[PDB]
Each structure stands twice: as structure tokens, then as C-alpha cells.
């Protein structure tokens, strides 16, 4: 399928253990589309302060497209000193591994995979 339903839990990013996907723009890309398929990905919601306590490269969430089910459809967007890989429109989050840490909530996403 093109697209696939995920609820991803969303954490604190002080409790994130794991704080990016890798090292280069295409690694974070891949890495983030494994961990999304296994579901093994949590979404930190980006607010000040936020991103200088995570690892670049950042993968983003934006939204595709203005919901089936409840689920926003999104793609993923990568950036690296400040240059984006990818267009899409509003950021729903940054992407994580997810490794055991306690949500605060759920986000209900439709994934263009």
C-alpha cells in the first residue's frame, strides 16, 4: 500500500534515549521508514528549545495534505544544517527511535511510504 495507518507515541524529549536515527540525511531517512514500518518510532512535538536536545540529522512528519479515520496523512522530511530534504507543509513533529519510553499520547498518522 502507498499508505499505511500508525498511531505513533509521542514522548518528552528529556526522556528520549535514542536521539536521532543516524548520521547522514539518507541514513536518517531510511532509518526513520524502518523503525516507522516496525513500529519502533516516536514522534517528539517540536516547541522551543526542543531540537538543540536532539541529534542531527532531524526527520520531520509534515503534513501531506488537509485526514482519513483521524489519520493526517504525512511524508517524511530530513534536515541538516539547515537545508531540508524534501517539501511538505506543517511539521506534526520530529521522529525518534522509540525504545521503551513512556508516552504522553498518540498520534494518529497515514504514512505515503
Known amino acids: ?13 528529556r526522556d528520549v534515549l535514542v536521539r536521532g536515527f543516524g548520521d547522514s540525511v539518507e541514513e ?8 516507522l514500518k516496525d513500529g519502533t518510532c516516536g514522534l517528539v ?31 517524511l522530511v530530513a534536515e541538516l544544517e539547515g537545508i531540508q530534504y524534501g517539501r511538505s507543509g506543517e511539521t506534526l513533529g520530529v521522529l525518534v527511535p522509540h525504545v521503551g519510553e513512556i508516552p504522553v499520547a498518540y498520534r494518529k498518522v497515514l504514512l505515503r511510504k
Do not use: C, N, W
Open 1 to 13: 500500500k502507498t499508505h499505511v495507518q500508525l498511531s505513533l507515541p509521542v514522548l518528552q524529549v
Open 28 to 35: 536518517v531517512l531510511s532509518e526513520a521508514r524502518q523503525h
Open 45 to 75: 512535538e517540536v516547541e522551543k528549545g526542543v531540537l538543540p536536545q536532539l541529534e542531527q540529522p532531524y526527520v520531520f512528519i509534515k503534513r501531506s495534505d488537509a485526514a482519513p479515520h483521524g489519520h493526517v496523512m504525512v511524508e
